[PDB]
Amino acid sequence: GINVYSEIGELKEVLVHTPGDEIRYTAPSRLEELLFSAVLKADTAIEEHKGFVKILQNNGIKVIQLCDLVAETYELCSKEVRNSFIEQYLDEALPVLKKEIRPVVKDYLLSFPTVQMVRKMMSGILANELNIKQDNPLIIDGMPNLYFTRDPFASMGNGVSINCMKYPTRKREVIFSRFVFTNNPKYKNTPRYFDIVGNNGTIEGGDIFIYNSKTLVIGNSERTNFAAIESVAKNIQANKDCTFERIVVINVPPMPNLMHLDTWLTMLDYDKFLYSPNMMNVLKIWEIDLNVKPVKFVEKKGTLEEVLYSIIDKKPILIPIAGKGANQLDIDIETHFDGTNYLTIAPGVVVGYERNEKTQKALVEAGIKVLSFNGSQLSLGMGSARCMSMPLIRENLKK
Amino acid sequence: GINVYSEIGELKEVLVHTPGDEIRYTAPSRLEELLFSAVLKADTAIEEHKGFVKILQNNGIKVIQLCDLVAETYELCSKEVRNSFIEQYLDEALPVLKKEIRPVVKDYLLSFPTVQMVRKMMSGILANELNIKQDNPLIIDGMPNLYFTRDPFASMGNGVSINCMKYPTRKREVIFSRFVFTNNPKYKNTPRYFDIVGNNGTIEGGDIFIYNSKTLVIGNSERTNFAAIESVAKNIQANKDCTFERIVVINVPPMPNLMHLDTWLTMLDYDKFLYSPNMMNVLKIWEIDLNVKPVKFVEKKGTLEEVLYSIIDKKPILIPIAGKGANQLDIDIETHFDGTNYLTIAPGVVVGYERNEKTQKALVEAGIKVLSFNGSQLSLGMGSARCMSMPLIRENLKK
Ligand SMILES: [Cl-]
Ligand SMILES: [Cl-]
């Protein structure tokens, strides 16, 4: 059920999540606590996400909703496994559930049709809903970052990496997709090159890129360390079907207005890349030959061009955020709105926010086809199309 | 040219400012520096403002654009007065203009037709525009807060109060309306019950309310002190035509998110008020008899209802933000989006953001007619309708 051996191959199946009531439950004083960037006008953001989904569907892509995938898995499970799912959810809920309120929540959840129940689990629960009186409006917090399906897990060739989020507020999001990879017959046998239980280190979706059939590119950032990368390398060596033979690790230290490797660099075509004009000049890299044991990180150095050349074996076309010659104001604004994170749905065809006009212009001038959409409210979340999606199946490249 | 003896009298003439390029020049890192709340999707915010203006116009209100009023004044002035205006603008420009750049900016400004020149002054100037190469993309910062015409000056009966802003970034805004009140024949003779030159203390538009022909209500806040209120009191006593006989000063304790009286209480009808449920229970008031000299601030205490009753002489109807029984989540969100600041265009008829649904519902249930508009982007500026307008002429009440 999983086959992603590039960042650009024609997209066939992708996972997304149209936001539900959870983005209505973020108090302005809890933006940091919930690790979300702003208070959205929900109805508008939701319609905008639907616009994003529609574009993907009109391009023959099968768009799968997280809530539907979880609901489908649930229906196929035994009563004990189903209950096991509900119980784990109650255990990880925040704020922690009081003993006499837990059973009230559980009965409430079970009173809804499967898909609506899953949606309540994602949205969180208001005290009013349970007829409970108290100042705190929420019995259970919602998970506002769920529409960023790029984080809980990342497809990786024929397997997946179920990521280790940083803060507990976001670690609650993993229960859904993990339930799918554990019980859904279509994904149950997907090999896990990383999981939150039998490995070492930490790793996040933003640092994971698949350049081609043989090369995996991971960022060594503040969120992804060598320990996790080593676990991934060994798990891959133990799998016979995987075609990966090499891992290129790119050192990504904290920089102003940037974060994971994705804010630094994205791949849009066989030889076209979008990058931050404010990244470092000479990159620190680590080459890992997967055909050799034990796994060893071979340190190397080079400009972005040199590093890219060593992977695609041809001159890379580098496009800076906001285009060449842009002033710092435009660069800052379009970086702020996640300008590098366009989602590539086919070689040279991308999807992103229309507000990032300078970057859009530079992309079309370089021969890339851009399918923009209005995300006037969605964009306040600070994450673009690549962040709001997780490819499940892409047509392998013939290069 | 000025006649505003209430907060609710049928609105005949009002001053607004549809944002120009200035709201395109706010770097995300300069939100605090420019004292603005977020990075707007300019084109969208501008159309939303036009929608706001359209509603006012469709209600028979004469809407006056600040840029047009300034341009009109400029044309009527002598060459020496005109240049006097340009020079002061150049003097107050930020960042400070370099000696060799100043003359370049001046010629640039003079090369545009009058109204376009005024718009450049308001919008600020990019280095690209002058073909200058430097670090700062801006030669002159824009004044993003210009569309909040409630701040520079506040109509007060038959006169005006040209306010003393707090930070220099916003003090630059006063030059435009002041130029009008100084040279336009229609406003030239308007008495100034306060100005940035011959008085004491500080005062801001958000603290000034006109309840009726005889009562002026001013908030004693972190932005408005007794010194400024005394200056206003004396200046009013010196005017023969003014009908004000009393001033009620309400103490507004500086909270983390409270700099003016307007976000605590607004008047929407002869006996209907919108208030913040997070305000103090017992108010500290000061009664000033304008028929008495010298001016003495007579302290007094009472509940919101008691204080209001002492002014309108009838039972006041109090409507809380988000309505009665609302949970803290809805109160917090609608407070965040300036829920009290509806603009009253006639007794019991208001205009405001459609996103504040709970407050809107409470208002209609209370008998108030609400003319909402989409401000999905404008609202990010943290100021509602009353903040985006300055009544010039209101039909006097007959009560
Ligand atoms: Cl957009
Ligand atoms: Cl709105």
Numbering used by the authors:
A (entry chain A), B (entry chain B): 54 to 452
Quote the authors verbatim.
The arginine deiminase pathway (ADI) is the most widespread anaerobic route for arginine degradation in microorganisms and performs the conversion of arginine to ornithine, ammonia, and CO2, generating one mole of ATP per mole of arginine consumed. The ADI pathway is composed by three catalytic enzymes: arginine deiminase (ADI, EC 3.5.3.6), ornithine carbamoyltransferase (OTC, EC 2.1.3.3) and carbamate kinase (CK, EC 2.7.2.2). Here we have described the structure of the three enzymes that constitute the gene cluster in the ADI pathway in Mycoplasma penetrans (together with the specific membrane-associated arginine permease coded by arcD gene) and compared them to previous structures of the enzymes. In this regard, M. penetrans possesses and expresses the complete set of the ADI pathway genes at the same time while exhibiting a fermentative metabolism.
ADI catalyzes the first step of the argininine degradation pathway, the deimination of arginine, producing citrulline and ammonium. In the present work we have resolved the structure of ADI from Mycoplasma penetrans at 2.3 Å, and comparison to previous substrate-bound structures of ADI from M.arginini reveals substantial structural rearrangements in the active site of the enzyme upon binding of the substrate. Crystals of M.penetrans ADI display a large unit cell composed of twelve molecules in the asymmetric unit. Based on results obtained by gel-filtration chromatography, the biological unit can be considered to be a dimer (making up 6 dimers in the asymmetric unit). The overall protein fold and the secondary structure elements found in previous ADI structures are conserved in M.penetrans and consist of the repetition of a three-stranded mixed β sheet and a helix forming five ββαβ modules in a cyclical arrangement. In the case of the arginine deiminase enzymes (ADI), this 5-fold pseudosymmetric α/β modular domain also contains an additional 85-residue α-helical domain between the first and second module (helices α4 to α8). The catalytic reaction of the ADI enzyme is performed by the catalytic triad composed of Cys440, His313 and Glu257, where the sulfur of Cys440 catalyzes a nucleophilic attack on the guanidino carbon of the arginine substrate. The apo-form ADI structure of M.penetrans would correspond to the “open” conformation of the enzyme, whereas the intermediate-substrate bound ADI structure of M.arginini would represent the “closed” conformation. In our “open” conformation of M.penetrans ADI, Cys440 is located in a similar position as in the “closed” conformation, whereas His313 and Glu257 need to move about 3 Å to interact with the arginine substrate.
